[PDB]
Amino acid sequence: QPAAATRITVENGTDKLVNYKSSPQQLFLAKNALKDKLQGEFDKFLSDAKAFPALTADLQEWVDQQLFNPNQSFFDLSAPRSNFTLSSDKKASLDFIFRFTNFTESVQLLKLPEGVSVVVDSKQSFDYYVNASAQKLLVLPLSLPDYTLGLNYMFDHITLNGKVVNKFSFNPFKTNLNLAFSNVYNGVDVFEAQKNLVGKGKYLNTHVKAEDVKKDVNANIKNQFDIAKIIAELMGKALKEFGNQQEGQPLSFLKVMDKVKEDFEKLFNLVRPGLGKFVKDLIQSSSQAENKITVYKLIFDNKKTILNLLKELSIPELNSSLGLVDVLFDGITDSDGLYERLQSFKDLIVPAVKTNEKTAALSPLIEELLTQKDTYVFDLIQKHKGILTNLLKNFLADFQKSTPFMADQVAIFTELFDNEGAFDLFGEADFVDKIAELFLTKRTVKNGEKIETKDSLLVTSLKSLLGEKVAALGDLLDSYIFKNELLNRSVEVAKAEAKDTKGATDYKKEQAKALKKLFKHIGENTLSKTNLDKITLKEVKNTENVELEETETTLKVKKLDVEYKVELGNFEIKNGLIKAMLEFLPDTKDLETTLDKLLFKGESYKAMKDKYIKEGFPGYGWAKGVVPGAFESIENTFKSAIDKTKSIRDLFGDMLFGNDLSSVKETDSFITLGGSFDIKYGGENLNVLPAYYSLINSEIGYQIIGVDTTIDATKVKVELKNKEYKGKSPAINGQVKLSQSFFNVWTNMFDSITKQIFQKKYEFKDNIQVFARNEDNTSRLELDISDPEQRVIPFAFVDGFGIQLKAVD
């Protein structure tokens, strides 16, 4: 028969951690370090009430799987005797008896997972001598779907058959104790990891080659440059569609992705191979897409990339499902049944899917989209909000974390997404006009007195950017650059002072006209494809093989010398780009009031006027009435030598273009970048160690720590092609000419900016984390990740800094 199981239940629970030292509240230790504290946890869960039922289940599993599955067709079983000594003593001494007898009339042999080899005849009562010595239970790690620390037992002694089976195991790699962890796992931490993974001819040493290192670094530089070119082209392949349209027809950010689907595909398969088609299909899985598709063929038109992007996490499911991920790839199971079988196997796929809540957070969304069908995508798949824009922000943030020095784009996108709104611009809307409602509108929606205290976003951005660099035009920036409707729309005020829909009434458009013209210009002249063609990167040295240095448990880089003369060609910061953002300034003919307010009836010249009225003019002394004869004809000359037919637009036109506004053509030259600047990655005596992902991964990389990134921006010629003056009717022509004076001062200040704000041989030190991927997405560097000795755990906090699994002790 069989032994009686009075404690066959296996229900149990997990454990927790306690803060120590100055580690953050997020405790994520690994194995090692506490090799004797898991001893304590196992003893604690070993010498209590719920321990002996679990040991009953352990012995049940052993006597079931390890005794009579290779038996029991021709050997019966009987184990009348059973006792436990699992008290608080925590020791080990077991006392069972199991009797084996055969009912068959034949000579057979007992199959046991042990040194068992003996002839057995029919009707024989095999004796299985069960006894134990005194010992303490070691600890085995589990191969759970969680790969937790194995709060479990490695046995050391059982006196069986009259002998000892050294380092015995009762059913290894499985236990009925369910003592999983959510914080601390098993393996080699990062440095005990960087102890059996780096050596003389060991793993990382033998799987990284000098030619591969050089190819990886040079391809990283080329990818950086080229991705910059794609990003610029988009900013000019999207701006052209933003601004080329006439008002009255919307064009949002999701609609504009229709014109740059292949552009995103190129960008995303250049940042990471195999992902370009994914993002193009993703954009096609939107409301504004030309074709409407579901998320099933989207999620399965690559498989590996999506599973390894979403499920990354630390583990415990990626490499675990890698026993079924390859099985999941099998049969590609065949067409017209592949969909059905994948929907069927989602039932066991879903745990890895639901183990989310890191940066990639749309895994719950995809699991709801995959459990049941989805049809309309025209809001039903838009309420997920883990949508094109959010995922774009996520992956671009990842790119920034890998490429720190393009911080401007990710930053500006962050305050773009800093609001809970603007989600409709990720769908059917009009992009530039709505963002003007967001960037260039003082929201005052009411009619009592005034709700103008909602300063627009672009005003705040420029007041933070150009805050107090110059003190003269700050009041100008407030008065006519910001208190304007051009940089502060003041909605509902247009329909509060007129309320008849006149041409100049609708102030959302008059700002929009100039902003859209600037977008059109950037989309056809400056950042067009034709003009962005002539921004070329070329090799300089790129020939010396970067051989590795090895010294025991270390791996070093001898020397690096790579230079990249980024030829700027003649990038045409064209006359006309500035013309639009000059249209940002008012064109009203009331110039005289503006100059009277800024220069005379202001905050500082008024003080000097009062001072000179009171006293002054040294040398004269007694002449007090002359002062109201001095600041009465100087102002007369200044305000009589201004042509009223010109507007402040034309004043800044003289200041910037040189000649006046309407006589200056867009097909001129205004700024034409010359020469070429150089990037100088290099480093000598640099360490190299196994590079892990932002969190754990099965796929080891290799990062070269200590690269000295020298950016020499010199050897450029930023010419201001209108460097002289040829004017005929200056706005302030006369004996007080500012237009020529302003042109001189602007040329001087712009030369100062281009000489100082630009090249200074900026130096920067960082680390290159390159995960060299093979042709068919089969990255060369890898571990066995099978034995409980190479499961590296980067999320560990090393015990060298000090870790104790006790509450502040």
Numbering used by the authors: 60 to 868
Study text:
Here, we report a comprehensive structural and functional analysis of the previously uncharacterized protein P116 (MPN_213). Single-particle cryo-electron microscopy of P116 reveals a homodimer presenting a previously unseen fold, forming a huge hydrophobic cavity, which is fully accessible to solvent. Lipidomics analysis shows that P116 specifically extracts lipids such as phosphatidylcholine, sphingomyelin and cholesterol. Each monomer consists of two distinct domains: the core domain (residues 246–867) and the amino-terminal domain (residues 60–245), situated distal to the dimer axis.
To obtain empty P116 that is free of any bound ligands, we treated the P116 samples with the detergent Triton X-100. The structure of the empty P116 sample was solved by cryoEM at 4-Å resolution. Its overall topology is almost identical to that of the original P116 sample; however, the core domain is constricted as a result of fingers 1, 2 and 3 being closer to the palm by 8, 13 and 12 Å, respectively, and finger 4 moving 11 Å sideways to retain the distal core access to the cavity. In the empty P116, the dimerization interface is shifted towards the dorsal side of the molecule by 10 Å, resulting in a contraction that changes the arc diameter of the dimer to ~10 nm and shifts the N-terminal domain towards the dimerization interface. Most prominently, the arc diameter of the empty structure is approximately 10 nm smaller than that of the original and refilled structures. In the empty P116, we observed a substantial reduction of lipids, with no specific lipid class enriched.
